[PDB]
Symmetry: none
Subunit: 130 residues, 2 copies
């Protein structure tokens, strides 16, 4: 169910590295992908890149971008973000509390806490969760 | 075990995450303490708590940023990596209460107490060659 909702996203990311390109200047890109610690202030900019990809990847599949799918933020994080910033990146995206992460029918936000758990699996290879 | 297997895999997949960003908030002295083969006395608990945590909420503490719950696979990975067999147990004792990835995802509060943590992190450490400590680490104070 979600397993799939991932896949469709991972396969989307893997495909973007070519055919399409995101709203990202080689600067913002070095910024998002490098190992250079994201200093406090950088919050606004990090968010805006992670979004650039998240929504971007979305647009480049035909999926709406009203609530950003959890799986995409996790993927967009795992894939692009460097370990030096992963965790912090999650707590940053939580900050873009767009959808109330469906967990037992209840409309509960997309807490940073779970975003990590996701990205951590993506990288792990699993995602054949459930 | 096809379950206990994927847990490990995530824990392993974590080591690499830890190795990659060696950003830690500990003086070289502190580092020596945390990785020493000398036991952690009952008074050293405060110090240890700070050290084991400085390894989990990694770059998060180096800079400001709040802290947020980490998955067991990732904690167990940290202990297996930094902590010495001698203190590992107290470490798990310290970090008891964490949750596994699965439960983190579906919202099923299943705190993983010390005993369990200890058992698991020991098996994590038990299996992982491309994991071990070196010196391109003693570069944070």
């Amino acid at each position: 169910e979600q397993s799939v909702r991932f896949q469709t996203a991972l396969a989307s990311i893997k495909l973007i590295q070519a055919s399409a390109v995101l709203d990202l200047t080689e600067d913002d890109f070095d910024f998002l992908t490098s190992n250079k610690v994201w200093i406090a202030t950088d919050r606004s900019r990090a968010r805006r890149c992670v979004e650039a990809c998240v929504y971007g990847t979305l647009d480049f599949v035909g999926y709406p971008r009203f609530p950003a799918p959890v799986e995409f933020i996790a993927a967009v994080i795992a894939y692009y973000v460097h370990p030096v910033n992963i965790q912090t990146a999650c707590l940053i995206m939580e900050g873009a509390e767009f959808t109330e992460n469906i967990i037992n029918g209840v409309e509960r936000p997309v807490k940073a806490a779970e975003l990590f758990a996701f990205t951590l699996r993506v990288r792990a290879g699993n995602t054949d969760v459930l």
